[PDB]
Amino acid sequence: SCPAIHVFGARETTASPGYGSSSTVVNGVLSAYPGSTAEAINYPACGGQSSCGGASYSSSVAQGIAAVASAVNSFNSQCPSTKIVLVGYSQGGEIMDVALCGGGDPNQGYTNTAVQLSSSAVNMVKAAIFMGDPMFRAGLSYEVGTCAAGGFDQRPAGFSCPSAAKIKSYCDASDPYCCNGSNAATHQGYGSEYGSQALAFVKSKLG
């Protein structure tokens, strides 16, 4: 059968297969909505290390965007009335960001600027949670956190996401990857810092 709610989680770089740090809000939704089900995005989650298959960051991102698109689009065709939630941490956030918001990822060589999710799938995506997304750029309506600058793959000024109202993207000032800070520790704690906020948001979008 099809569940009423299905969630997709995408892990950070070098994390072992599964959800990695997206687990905190993935698990939050599942336990908030018994009978809901979840799946991990299958993609390299790599930055050239041999442990994760040696793919470069650029190649990992390209493959991840396609992976998100394929898994979400196919699921939606199978379960068209199922509400979808996306959760992505760091690189996992960046691949969902492109897939859902379009605009490509010029720094990583992804040239296609089209939204990659189908129109049907975008409609049934009800909430998207990004944490530590290197495409972060302060000044977008869907962002929260203390970062007032942007990450190494930051969106350009004046960017707009058609699905802005379905998203929350979190990043603080001292983060070296989604912001221009220098405390890596910050990158690793968004789960405990914003998980509860994130869950409330998802809740308000789901009913």
Of the residues 97, 105, 172, 175, only one is catalytic, namely 175
Gap between the Cα atoms of 147 and 175, Å rounded: 8
Of the residues 97, 105, 133, 187, only one is catalytic, namely 187
Cβ atoms of 11 and 3 closer than 8 Å: no
Cβ atoms of 63 and 41 closer than 8 Å: no
| Domain boundaries of the chain, sorted by first residue | 1-207
* Residue partners of 180: CB distance under 8 A and separation at least 6: 149, 150, 151
Which residue(s) pair with 143 in the sheet?
Answer: 169
Gap between the Cα atoms of 88 and 68, Å rounded: 10
Q: Please work out, in degrees rounded to the nearest 5, the angle formed at the alpha carbon of residue 168 by the alpha carbons of 12 and 159.
A: 95
* Residue 90 annotated in active site: yes
Cα 132 → chain centroid: 9
Which residue(s) pair with 110 in the sheet?
Answer: 105
Of the residues 6, 90, 105, 172, only one is catalytic, namely 90
Q: Is 164 left (phi over 0), alpha (psi -120 to 50) or beta?
A: alpha
Gap between the Cα atoms of 71 and 100, Å rounded: 13
* Residue partners of 113: CB distance under 8 A and separation at least 6: 102, 103, 104
Greatest C-alpha distance within the chain: 47
- What Å distances lie between residue 110 and 9, 28, 121, CA to CA? 21, 32, 21
Which residue(s) pair with 170 in the sheet?
Answer: 131, 144
For tokens 């009800």, the residue is 126
> Residue 188 — φ and ψ, nearest 5°?
-95, 0
What does the block give as tokens for 40?
A: 């991990």
Q: How many CB atoms lie within 10 A of CB 113?
A: 11
* Residue 6 annotated in active site: no
* SS3 annotation, the chain: CCCCEEEEEECCCCCCCCCHHHHHHHHHHHHHCCCCEEEECCCCCCCCCHHHCCCCHHHHHHHHHHHHHHHHHHHHHHCCCCEEEEEEECHHHHHHHHHHHCCCEHHHCECCCCCCCCHHHHHHEEEEEEECCCCCECCCCCEECCCCCECCCCCCCCCCCCCHHHEEEECCCCCCCCCCCCCHHHHCCHHHHHHHHHHHHHHHHHC
Experimental method: X-ray
* Residue partners of 106: CB distance under 8 A and separation at least 6: none
Experimental structure resolution, Å: 1.8
What does the block give as tokens for 60?
A: 């990992």
Cβ atoms of 142 and 169 closer than 8 Å: yes
- What Å distances lie between residue 100 and 56, 127, 193, CA to CA? 22, 11, 24
Q: How many CB atoms lie within 10 A of CB 206?
A: 16
What does the block give as tokens for 158?
A: 């004046």
CATH class of the domain comprising 1-207: alpha beta
